């Protein structure tokens, strides 16, 4: 255990003593609002955290999650509650100690990376120490080190705006790490990047946490971004609906009825977007390029008029290429093609025969999607 929270909360607007007394009894948020006009962002929040225990915090825009972070850092003064870190409360600290804490223990990362465009990446990296009144030698040393640890040092002594979002994110992360903090607050950090860079950075962060075991408040509105890394998740709708974490307990034993609509817990609506190849125009080399980009081994084949035609395989394409032959001949028109609305145990005996999926072709030849073992899931749900 590292952190511990007690009846923490935060209230905005005015006439906040009445709202405090209200929440001291259990007054819902809407009623408090109507009666006082003091919008609440946090409500009787109680939980704890351990070391290396990445504690994601989910929710929708308005669940008042980033607010909880800025409270932990005390950037926003808590209306009430306590925060017992290292046997040291945080809401009852003077200015000096709070600053030393922010300098030693905690460090933040932000959505748009919170970078000073009027500086060089090195300077933005070392700021956390600059404000600690330390010599420039070790400042620059730790900076260069953290940057080498992110494989962008050479891009130093430049400015942010001339970089890519991913690089600036790595930069803010190095800025936060330089201090060797025991904690890392993150407010939808990777939410501004491309999903590809997003996954890359998720894995890099996991590698880091493996090397250095330090606690992390993460935040995000994407359940996958949490499940990939989260060791103990906490969902949030103006309150701790569920914080047990475990990743699955949220899915295994979702206590409330709103989490289950958040995680999206009988028809074959599972048809997924398909990967097409208009044989009438494109060729084997093109199909191979597509297989490469989409990162797959086969593809679906249609007509110039979007009419389903069949299936293609990597080897079939390579053979048509070597032979110089075209498509529409080296194909597999024999397929377990299916219709949009059927049972989950309909193509049960064939789904195993066809290694390739079973395209859900429209009645009129058109195509919608495919099925790859996502039918098994809901088929066994009965």
């Amino acid at each position: 255990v590292k952190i511990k929270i007690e009846h923490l909360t935060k209230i905005f607007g005015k006439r906040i003593k009445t709202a405090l007394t209200m929440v001291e009894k259990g007054e819902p948020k809407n009623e408090i609002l109507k009666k006082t006009g003091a919008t609440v962002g946090v409500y009787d929040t109680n939980f704890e955290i351990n070391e290396g225990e990445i504690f994601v915090i989910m929710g929708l825009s308005g669940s008042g999650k980033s607010t909880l972070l800025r409270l932990l850092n005390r950037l926003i003064e808590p209306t009430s509650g306590k925060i017992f870190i290292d046997n040291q409360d945080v809401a009852t600290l003077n200015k000096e100690d709070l600053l030393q804490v922010r300098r030693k223990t905690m460090s933040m990362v932000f959505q748009n990376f919170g970078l000073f465009p009027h500086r060089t990446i090195l300077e933005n990296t070392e700021y956390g120490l600059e404000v600690q009144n330390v010599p420039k030698e070790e400042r620059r040393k730790r900076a260069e080190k953290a940057l080498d640890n992110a494989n962008l040092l050479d891009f130093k002594d430049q400015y942010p705006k001339q970089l890519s979002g991913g690089m600036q994110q790595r930069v803010g992360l190095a800025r936060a790490l330089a201090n060797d903090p025991e904690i890392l607050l993150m407010d939808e950090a990777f939410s501004a990047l491309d999903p590809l860079i997003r996954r890359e950075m998720q894995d890099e962060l996991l590698e880091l946490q493996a090397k250095f075991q330090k606690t992390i408040i993460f935040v995000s509105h994407d359940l996958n971004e949490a499940l990939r890394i989260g060791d103990r998740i906490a969902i949030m709708k103006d309150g701790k609906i569920m914080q047990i974490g475990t990743g699955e307990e949220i899915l295994t034993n979702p206590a409330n009825d709103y989490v289950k609509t958040f995680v999206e817990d009988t028809a074959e609506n599972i048809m997924i977007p398909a990967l097409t190849t208009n044989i009438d125009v494109d060729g084997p080399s093109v199909a191979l390029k597509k297989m490469k980009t989409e990162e797959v081994s086969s593809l679906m084949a249609v007509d110039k008029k979007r009419q389903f035609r069949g299936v293609v395989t990597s080897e079939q394409a390579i053979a048509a290429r070597k032979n110089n032959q075209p498509l529409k001949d080296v194909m597999t028109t024999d397929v377990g093609t299916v219709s949009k609305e059927m049972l989950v145990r309909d193509i049960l005996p064939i789904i195993y025969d066809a290694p390739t999926p079973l395209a859900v072709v429209d009645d009129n030849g058109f195509l919608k999607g495919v099925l790859i073992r996502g039918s098994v899931l809901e088929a066994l749900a009965d």
Binding site: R70, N73, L75, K95, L98, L99, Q100, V101, R102, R103, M106, S107, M108, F110, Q111, N112, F113, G114, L115, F116, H118, Y127, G128, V131, Q132, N179
Partner: protein
Amino acid sequence: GQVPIANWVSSATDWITSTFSSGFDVIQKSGTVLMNGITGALTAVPFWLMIAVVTILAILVSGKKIAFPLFTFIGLSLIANQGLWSDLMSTITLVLLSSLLSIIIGVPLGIWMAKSDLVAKIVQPILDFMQTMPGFVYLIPAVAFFGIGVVPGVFASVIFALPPTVRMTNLGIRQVSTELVEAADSFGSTARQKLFKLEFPLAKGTIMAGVNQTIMLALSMVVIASMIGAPGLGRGVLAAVQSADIGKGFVSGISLVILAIIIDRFTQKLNV
């Protein structure tokens, strides 16, 4: 029915002078002498040397293009020519004084405003109230307190050109992206730290813009105060007005313009 705002205001004025007399008097003394001294200094230098100095300065700021330094030398030759130099230097000391005073007295206010949301409410109304006033009033209490001269003029100029300085300040400071604020604060940076590392280096643009504005306002206010002491080309243009003398009025005003354009082209190119 009538209400006696005239008498109230009269009485208030009376009471103040009649309380802060000595302050006003010594302030007057110091002001004028200083101004006199400053004027005597400039007007000690020749005109030719001053023109050449300003010309080099232009080149310094703008090394390649030839229009602005050319025009500066031209107009200053012309101004020295008609003999409006001592008056010019009076005007410049008046401005520099008013502008520096308004800066030194407003910038801290933009600070205090960007920091406290109360002071904003208190002041913004005062700022609009003062930004809508005319100049003419400002100089009546000026004489009421100090009397005729330069001191009253620069007082009026300060009180007239403070608003935009303060406003652009508080705005350039409240407009820094909150991410950078939160960052500076997350590393334990006291208000001074972020303020002298983060706030200024960014808001400087808007600050210098409001300052240029303040300078121009002080200039116009001096041209006005010319009707009371306040030496400078304001007196020449004034006489031309009260005498309908087109020539000298246009001439004083053109010298003033040349000066103002020069001050601008200088200020603009001192922001970055």
